[PDB]
Design a protein around this ligand. Structure first.
Ligand SMILES: *[C@@H]1O[C@H](CO[C@@H]2O[C@@H](C)[C@@H](O)[C@@H](O)[C@@H]2O)[C@@H](O[C@@H]2O[C@H](CO)[C@@H](O)[C@H](O)[C@H]2NC(C)=O)[C@H](O)[C@H]1NC(C)=O
Ligand SMILES: *[C@@H]1O[C@H](CO[C@@H]2O[C@@H](C)[C@@H](O)[C@@H](O)[C@@H]2O)[C@@H](O[C@@H]2O[C@H](CO)[C@@H](O)[C@H](O)[C@H]2NC(C)=O)[C@H](O)[C@H]1NC(C)=O
Ligand SMILES: *[C@@H]1O[C@H](CO[C@@H]2O[C@@H](C)[C@@H](O)[C@@H](O)[C@@H]2O)[C@@H](O[C@@H]2O[C@H](CO)[C@@H](O)[C@H](O)[C@H]2NC(C)=O)[C@H](O)[C@H]1NC(C)=O
Ligand SMILES: *[C@@H]1O[C@H](CO[C@@H]2O[C@@H](C)[C@@H](O)[C@@H](O)[C@@H]2O)[C@@H](O[C@@H]2O[C@H](CO)[C@@H](O)[C@H](O)[C@H]2NC(C)=O)[C@H](O)[C@H]1NC(C)=O
Ligand SMILES: *[C@@H]1O[C@H](CO)[C@@H](O)[C@H](O)[C@H]1NC(C)=O
Ligand SMILES: *[C@@H]1O[C@H](CO)[C@@H](O)[C@H](O)[C@H]1NC(C)=O
Ligand SMILES: *[C@@H]1O[C@H](CO)[C@@H](O)[C@H](O)[C@H]1NC(C)=O
Ligand SMILES: *[C@@H]1O[C@H](CO)[C@@H](O)[C@H](O)[C@H]1NC(C)=O
Ligand SMILES: *[C@@H]1O[C@H](CO)[C@@H](O)[C@H](O)[C@H]1NC(C)=O
Ligand SMILES: *[C@@H]1O[C@H](CO)[C@@H](O)[C@H](O)[C@H]1NC(C)=O
Ligand SMILES: *[C@@H]1O[C@H](CO)[C@@H](O)[C@H](O)[C@H]1NC(C)=O
Ligand SMILES: [Cl-]
Lengths: 526, 524, 174
């Protein structure tokens, strides 16, 4: 041991790891599709022709091409999200963590990484399945999927650049688990997708894709949903951007297919560079190349499918963090530094609004100003206001609204409001419970003793881990043993959600009702 | 400015309030000084006086001891009486807004202080603001406390018990017969009180004698069903006798013991009061309300249990940290000066202080239920606070509301959780017992006063909600886009949180803990 | 108590003492008390609680409280309707004439045998022919159960509600 699994594609060697005085077998870097190179760039992921021999699956594989956030070189806070393996066009691999001893029929969890469809990789320390396998005895799988232009370049209906390639990657990863996980003792019949930010959005898209209906069982959505403003691109911009990219690399043409031929020949880095520029103005949140209505993976605008109950029927767990917005302020909002406590002026608030809502009518920005700056004298007012604006508009509202409309079609849905600030959080107090900073608690990182999270925090993680685990296994996110708070189903009438924190978890109603009325009812009209 | 009361005339006095006038009638007598031969008796009718009564200074507070743990400290002293103690103290105040209103809803205040202490003249009970801002009439009275008010010799008309309660009731009758002359509407009367004040309010709901003397009720941190609020007919006696012995008043003819005591000096009585029990607690209400078969016609838990009370709306609520205030009067480790971190050993010690008579097992359960930690230094400090909070205030409070609403009435419940920034006690005591009263009487509305803007708003809101509750039986603030305050049903048990940030609607206040106090503890 | 709850905190054993020895003077008090303690804690409560939680997921469940002492019971009166001493009535042993169970007892067994048989066959433990008591479904709300004995079988609610609260809610915490 020496431990080999016989996948319907070939053999793969794992590697034992120690976890809290236990063994977990890790299979890192298994290829699930055929490297999408040269002639395959911009295409749907291709079948894997069975390899002969043993695949040594003992190091994370190459992350996919992407730009790297370099606002704060050396800063953990920002860098912990940067890829930690070689960027490459060759990146369609996935990881599996089965607990040891090999389990009989384990529920499988599949992770999908966030990062605006532009950045991300499964190999991040915060996405380490090894703990979940150890503690809740499930199999955890994660995959890498193409991002930015390379994964979502869209030339509508044109099979050369049909769009949503990254999404199809994910899907092929699901098929893989479908055909193989049993060999590791996984139960293909009990599969729960979960992701965060674009990850969550992807999870939600899978609920809508018929292609995915049967590739999984349940779904968890952490800070994100397709109906978020940043998540889907109109078939119009999709084109404008594909063309803009073409111009920007001297690839303009007559035969459309030729433009793809052209681009198929540029250097990854030359593409990665211009991506930033295919829109007139951008935001800290610009998702330049994302999912589109391709009439393949997505068969119609998804708000319509959601609206009219056209999606997998099953339970869902959904939730957000107390301060989704803050993380972004520091990438362009005048007055905001990660270093000063970023008190800003009314004048600057107006300024911040211009940054996050570039194309929005002057009236539109006025309404936002008006709704959020109706003060309850206090210095931080405008600072926090702009936070919530971004928070509420990009994450918390579309999140809530998805949950709402989904449960209307008769399914159980649970909602959480995560409101705990890791005490090891490298960013400043004021950014509060930040976007993406619950992931570590979900993957159970605080369970690691020599790690310096607090006792409070170890407990919390242990609880969440269980709730999630349970939700995966039985479609019910209860913690039944340590006298916990019962987590109520989210009905479209009363709209209850559970708060997650180290003190007391409480049951509450109608999260951000006031604000989301504005974002949901009024603002789409300006 | 003269009013023609069915007893005589009384001169008011104009006062300036937020660029407005309010007429104050301080010190109106409502009964006949209970002196010598009247000591320990039900309050006596007022023989109409001839002439004008100048009602322009607060009257004498009633006899009582004075908290002297912290001489010079505002925190404790602000509650001490601010007028001469006297056996002659049955007077009451009215604050009508100016101009004299037509049919104003009236609010009657009842002061707390364990039935042992208190007086209407306290700065924090100043009705002048409420009259000004919500255009209601505010009345408050003084009632006998301690032995002098509640000395009980069951069924013996010489010391029939609950005298102070009857005082209060006579004050109600007074408003009943007179408030119209000040443009009060006797038909729309809301009682409100706090601590023993609240408990009195609740007792009034049970007294048939009071059924018709008022309309609605508000109960702030307190309810008769609280452990400290009613005395068994047995202790009532043991204590009346103990007091007799302690002043050489023991006897054969019972009436003679009253004769004896009727002759000792107020101070001599006040002194021994502290001692009529074997051991005491910071919360000992030595001479309180009892089942007198007059004011209370049967044990009140039974009356509450079987829906024998005035049917009407009620507003009930408590503060985040009811317990802390008392820790500093005997709990080993607790000072108002150090941040009072204490040890497991000391916690056990604290328990002995607050539950003297309780079985060794009984104290163990308490230890067990509250010290099941979630490593943190303050644990035991906070635990002991909650224990006192939950047991003496928060649970009986909740349980009252619950049982009361079962009989088909609208009830609203609040959890007041804001710490006045002008709070003289230390941070750790948090939102303390009795420190919402100021926000109710709208003290933060006073600009030159240094409460925060946050705080002015809050008070403005409460004042309105209360005011509204008094007027229409509904504690809503309908105009400033406020949170709707849901009715408290026995099923879902929703309450409204009151604070400067966001007021929220929540369920099942302290469900875990009160199960223990309500279901388990009465059995140990 | 020390014998049956060896590892249990001193407090824990105190609670048990306290809950069960709140007498209604009678000599057997403590004897019966300790019986019920073991009865309630090891059998009757976990039994009831299982039934409860199981029926919550929408299934029909029936509950019986067997309260007849075989007249051929080799143990002493005081041990009463003992653990395991309904088995013989379920397998119909009293149906054997030359066996010296009473007539009362033959009937009873015949009834149980039928109810069981029926329950096996049709998922309903009724005895439909001899004008019997209908055996109600056990709902998590009203918690009805049927008593089994030679005199009259009755329908009752909330078996040992008082005690099982203690065993189910409180005791797992000590
Ligand atoms: C679609 O794209 C056009 C062109 O975008 C420009 O050229 C690209 C190659 C890239 O370099 C971008 O940065 C450029 O902006 C957009 O037209 C531009 O944007 C606005 C028009 O609203 C205008 O201020 C610019 O001057 C235009 N650029 C030029 C020089 O033509 C346009 O925004 C997009 N179309 C829509 C309506 O989405
Ligand atoms: C808060 O800091 C921002 C960010 O500035 C950087 O970080 C600071 C710690 C400090 O070291 C700055 O010098 C760094 O540049 C400040 O934003 C700057 O403000 C001035 C105008 O007021 C401007 O000249 C800079 O270009 C601004 N930088 C940007 C791009 O916003 C901000 O002023 C600080 N605010 C306060 C009052 O604390
Ligand atoms: C009722 O009172 C008796 C007597 O109280 C004592 O005498 C009073 C005048 C006063 O001075 C108190 O401080 C005294 O305690 C109580 O009996 C006493 O209390 C306990 C008995 O439980 C005992 O330790 C004391 O020694 C007793 N005092 C003496 C010297 O007799 C008794 O507590 C009360 N009765 C009940 C059951 O409520
Ligand atoms: C916290 O303070 C209490 C109260 O003590 C008083 O106030 C303090 C600020 C300090 O000036 C004391 O000397 C004052 O007496 C302390 O309680 C005392 O502690 C010792 C035993 O440890 C004892 O000799 C005294 O009699 C205690 N007083 C009483 C009646 O409780 C307490 O020790 C302090 N705790 C800490 C560690 O901060
Ligand atoms: C794969 O890696 C393992 C490392 O221990 C080793 O046993 C085996 O020889 C390797 N096979 C190769 C060289 O591919
Ligand atoms: C695993 O569990 C499923 C039930 O969801 C079952 O149908 C499947 O056959 C099982 N495979 C085994 C026996 O491991
Ligand atoms: C419950 O808490 C205990 C510690 O008392 C711990 O052993 C166990 O892991 C916890 N269970 C969960 C799901 O948190
Ligand atoms: C009562 O007091 C007022 C004070 O202004 C005065 O006008 C009046 O003379 C007084 N009457 C008396 C002396 O009682
Ligand atoms: C005062 O108001 C009440 C209504 O609650 C009314 O019945 C009473 O007669 C009024 N008196 C007046 C007219 O002031
Ligand atoms: C509502 O707020 C306004 C200030 O905008 C104030 O004038 C008014 O008094 C408030 N009303 C209440 C009941 O607080
Ligand atoms: C009903 O009683 C009769 C005797 O009258 C008997 O023959 C029959 O076996 C009984 N049926 C059942 C199910 O007990
Ligand atoms: Cl919030």
């Amino acid at each position: 041991d020496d431990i080999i699994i016989a996948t319907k594609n070939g053999k793969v060697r794992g590697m034992q790891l120690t976890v809290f005085g236990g063994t977990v077998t890790a299979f890192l870097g298994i290829p699930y599709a055929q490297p999408p190179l040269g002639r395959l760039r911009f295409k749907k992921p291709q079948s894997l022709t069975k390899w002969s021999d043993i695949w040594n699956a003992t190091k994370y594989a190459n992350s996919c091409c992407q730009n790297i956030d370099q606002s704060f070189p050396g800063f953990h806070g920002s860098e912990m999200w940067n890829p930690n393996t070689d960027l490459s066009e060759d990146c369609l691999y996935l990881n599996v963590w089965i607990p040891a001893p090999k389990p009989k029929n384990a529920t499988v969890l599949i992770w999908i990484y966030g990062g605006g469809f532009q950045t991300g990789t499964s190999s991040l320390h915060v996405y380490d399945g090894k703990f979940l396998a150890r503690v809740e005895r499930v199999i955890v799988v994660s995959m890498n999927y193409r991002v930015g232009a390379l994964g979502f370049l869209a030339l509508p209906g044109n099979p050369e650049a049909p769009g949503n390639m990254g999404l199809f990657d994910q899907q092929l990863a699901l098929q893989w688990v479908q055909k193989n996980i049993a060999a590791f003792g996984g139960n293909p019949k009990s599969v729960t997708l979960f992701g965060e930010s674009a990850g969550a959005a992807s999870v939600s898209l899978h609920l809508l894709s018929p292609g995915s209906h049967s590739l999984f069982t349940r779904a968890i959505l952490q800070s994100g949903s397709f109906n978020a403003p940043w998540a889907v691109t109109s078939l119009y911009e999709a084109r404008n951007r594909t063309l803009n990219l073409a111009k920007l690399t001297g690839c303009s043409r007559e035969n459309e297919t030729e433009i793809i031929k052209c681009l198929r020949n540029k250097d990854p880095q030359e593409i990665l560079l211009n991506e930033a520029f295919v829109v007139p103005y951008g935001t800290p949140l610009s998702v330049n190349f994302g999912p589109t209505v391709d009439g393949d993976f997505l068969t119609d605008m998804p708000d319509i499918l959601l609206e009219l109950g056209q999606f997998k029927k099953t339970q869902i767990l959904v939730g957000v963090n107390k301060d989704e917005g803050t993380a972004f302020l520091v990438y362009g909002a005048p007055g905001f530094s990660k270093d000063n406590n970023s008190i800003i002026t009314r004048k600057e608030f107006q300024e911040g609004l211009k940054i996050f809502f570039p194309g929005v009518s002057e009236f539109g920005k006025e309404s936002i100003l008006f709704h959020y700056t109706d003060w309850v004298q206090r210095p931080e007012n405008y600072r926090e206001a702009l936070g919530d604006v971004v928070g509420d508009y990009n994450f918390i509202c579309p999140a809530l609204e998805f949950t709402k409309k989904f449960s209307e079609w008769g399914n159980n849905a649970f909602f959480y409001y995560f409101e705990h600030r890791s005490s090891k959080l490298p960013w400043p107090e004021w950014m509060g419970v930040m976007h993406g900073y619950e992931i570590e608690f979900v993957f159970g990182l605080p369970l690691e003793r020599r790690d310096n999270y607090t006792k409070a925090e170890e407990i919390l993680s242990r609880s969440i881990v269980k709730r999630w685990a349970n939700f995966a296994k039985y479609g019910n996110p209860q913690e039944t043993q340590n006298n916990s708070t019962s987590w109520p189903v989210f009905k479209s009438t009363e709209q209850k959600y559970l708060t997650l924190n180290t003190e007391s978890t409480r049951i509450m109603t109608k999260l951000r009702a006031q604000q989301c009325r504005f974002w949901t009812s009024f603002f789409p009209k300006v």
